[PDB]
Structure formats: C-alpha cells, structure tokens
From Swiss-Prot:
The keyword Transmembrane helix does not apply. This is Endothiapepsin. Residues 17-328 form the Peptidase A1 domain. Belongs to the peptidase A1 family. Its EC number is 3.4.23.22. Disulfide bonds join C255-C290. GO terms for biological process: proteolysis. The chain holds residues 90 to 419 of 419 of the full protein. The active site is at D35, S199.
Amino acid sequence: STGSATTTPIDSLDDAYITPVQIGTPAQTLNLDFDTGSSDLWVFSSETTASEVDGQTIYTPSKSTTAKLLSGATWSISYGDGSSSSGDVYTDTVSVGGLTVTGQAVESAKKVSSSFTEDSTIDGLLGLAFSTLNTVSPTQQKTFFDNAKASLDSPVFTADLGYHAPGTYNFGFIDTTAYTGSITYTAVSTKQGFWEWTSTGYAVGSGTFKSTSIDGIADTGTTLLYLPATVVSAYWAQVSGAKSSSSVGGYVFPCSATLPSFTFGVGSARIVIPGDYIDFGPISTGSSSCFGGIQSSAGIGINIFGDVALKAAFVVFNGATTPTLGFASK
Ligand SMILES: NCc1ncc(-c2ccc(F)cc2)[nH]1
Ligand SMILES: NCc1ncc(-c2ccc(F)cc2)[nH]1
C-alpha cells in the first residue's frame, strides 16, 4: 500500500505545517502537525478541558463505531520548547492520504499547554520518530508509520515541505518526479529515538565550505534550524546589524537586510537554504527588527534540522531494518 497527503503551512511564516488525517468511523478529519521529532499521535478531543480548546476541531470517540478505550493507558509529553499535553488513549482506525491503519493508538488530550490552545489551526500531532519515544504508559504504543510499515510497498515515508506553499507527505514510495538530481543517503542513529544523523559541514552564502561533523536530528515539528554557536555566529556575522538579543531570545537582524543562503552537507552532497527561508519577520507587529531562522542550539543539548532546513530538500525517512535518511535538492 501507499499514502499521499498534502501538507499546508499554518501561517505566512511557515511556523508549522498541517496535514489532514481521518480518524474513526465515520471519518472525523483533523489537521495534525506531522512531527518526526516525537512519537505520539495525540488530538484535541471531547475530553479536552473546555477552557483549553479555542477553535480546534475535536475527535469525539463516542461518535466512532471503531473506537475502543485502551483501558488503563495514559500519556503525558513535554516538548523541547516547553509545550505539553496529556490524557488517555483510544484505539481507532486512522487514515492518511489513503493509507489506513486499524488499531492505531489515538491519544486523547485532557490537558494541553497554552501554546497549543493558541494554535487554532493545529488539531494535534502525529509523531514520526521511533516508537521507543512513545509516552503511553504502562504499555508503550507504536507510531502510525511503525504500524503501517509492513503493509507499505517500501518501508519509507518522505517529507517535501513547501516554502510559503503546500507540500507533500508520502508513505511507502519515493516520487522520483519530486526532486532534482540524486538522493544522498546518510547513516542514522536511533539511540536517542530520533532521526539523528551527522552533517558533513556548512557554508555561508558564497563562502567556502567548512568540513566539520554536525550531529543533529531531522525534525519536521521544529520550525527553525538550531546549530552550534560557532556556526550560527559565522552565519549572522555576514548580515550587517545582526545581533544575538537576550531579551528577544535569539538572533535578530534588520528587516531591511537581504540574507545570505546557508548550505549544509549530506555526505559529499550539498543542500542550499535560500536566504529568504531564514527570514521569520518582525519580532512584533510593525517592528523593523526581524527574527532569524538559524539559531544557536547551545541551550538545547542537540542540534535540530527543523523546517528551515528540511523545506529546502526532498527528505526520505527510510525505516528499513537499519534506518537511514536521504536528502535531495528540489
Ligand atoms: N518565536 C515565537 C513564535 N511566534 C510564532 C510562533 C509559532 C510557533 C509554532 C506555531 F505552530 C505557531 C506559532 N512562535
Ligand atoms: N502558540 C504558538 C506555539 N508555540 C509553540 C508551538 C508549538 C507548535 C507545534 C509543536 F509541535 C510544538 C510547539 N506553538
């Protein structure tokens, strides 16, 4: 089998992307944030504290003839930015782009943090990291991809995120019309539960490529590109007036600037992030200080190849027995 679904930016900055997902019988369609940095499929629901729902579409398990309470199971997750959610668990039928999994764990939120309440466009998350990170207790549950994998034509999914435009998540096949040149594959460590890999270096603008190993994760659920302080300083030094602001929480730059591109290495291949992809706009409405899309990872403990980086590529998440990642230009 295969599936194919369009993913759409939630706002004019590409802060996140939402993909429609059918849950239950008859189908209830929710728009979920596909997150290769976590491993829980959780939704706003009829059980979510009413004051914490503000415009989201909710899953109502009592209206689904295929929903079953997973007795005794609870979940609770905290994300790298400090957001969080928790609740109980149903199993139900879940379909993405025509690909159907029966018996998928659908984690129903009883509580969500304010950041989620405020994102009226995000009805929940669909985790696509390794199932070892799933938070369901006392019986850990499998991700949608792990449940689907044996049925897929090939044990892969691909992320093709758009810049200020829709893109595509495919399951079970590699659309050879969706990228240019060849796909370069690179090794993955699953020891931390992430799609963790090692970039071979970077360049700033038209500058020379610096060969240096940068270990990090491919994370569709993170907006920005978080890299070591040395790398990020070298980038922003090329932008007149750019500075790290403790009060704002990262590098800012004059909105009048034209930003240089940033290149990262995948083996001997190179992915170029255009400068415009690194502009996240005014820090507050009407400000002439703009927020940078490349930020330091120093306070995080891991480097994160988030949407800023991934949207410049066609990305293969290869879930074969030994997983690997593939990157192509597009
Ligand atoms: N840097 C602060 C900030 N401004 C907007 C966001 C944001 C992030 C994710 C999301 F889904 C929606 C909005 N974060
Ligand atoms: N209210 C704005 C906002 N700040 C962080 C988030 C967020 C969105 C998606 C995600 F996966 C994790 C955090 N949204």
